[PDB]
Amino acid sequence: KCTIKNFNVNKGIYQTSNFRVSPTQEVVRFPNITNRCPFDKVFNATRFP
Amino acid sequence: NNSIAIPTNFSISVTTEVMPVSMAKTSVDCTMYICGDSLECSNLLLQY
Numbered sequence: 001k002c003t004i005k006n007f008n009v010n011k012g013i014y015q016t017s018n019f020r021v022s023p024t025q026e027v028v029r030f031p032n033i034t035n036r037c038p039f040d041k042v043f044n045a046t047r048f049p
Numbered sequence: 050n051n052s053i054a055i056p057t058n059f060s061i062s063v064t065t066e067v068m069p070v071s072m073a074k075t076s077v078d079c080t081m082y083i084c085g086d087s088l089e090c091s092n093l094l095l096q097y
């Protein structure tokens with residue numbers, strides 16, 4: 001009914017779109033790098049050129 | 050104006066003729082082609 005956009009359906013066969021399955025989980029995978037690069041040195045340096 | 054040609058013998062010939070009748074039936078889906086598995090794209094597709 002949602003595919004044909006109507007409440008009354010005639011007798012026959014019809015192809016239907018996807019309205020059944022929906023995701024419910026989140027999977028995040030990042031590399032395990034722990035070192036913190038300095039934004040206190042490239043930004044707050046001694047003297048910019 | 051006074052000569053004719055009348056055949057004295059014959060032959061039986063079998064010839065082949067090929068004719069197409071039908072082709073493949075194709076069904077498409079607007080979902081999982083235009084947007085795929087993406088709810089944000091599917092939300093904007095409801096107006097079409």
Ligand SMILES: *[C@@H]1O[C@H](CO)[C@@H](O)[C@H](O)[C@H]1NC(C)=O
Pocket residue numbers: 044
């Ligand atoms: C930069 O560092 C100096 C000392 O390390 C500090 O006095 C200054 O406030 C810093 N600049 C900023 C914008 O935080």
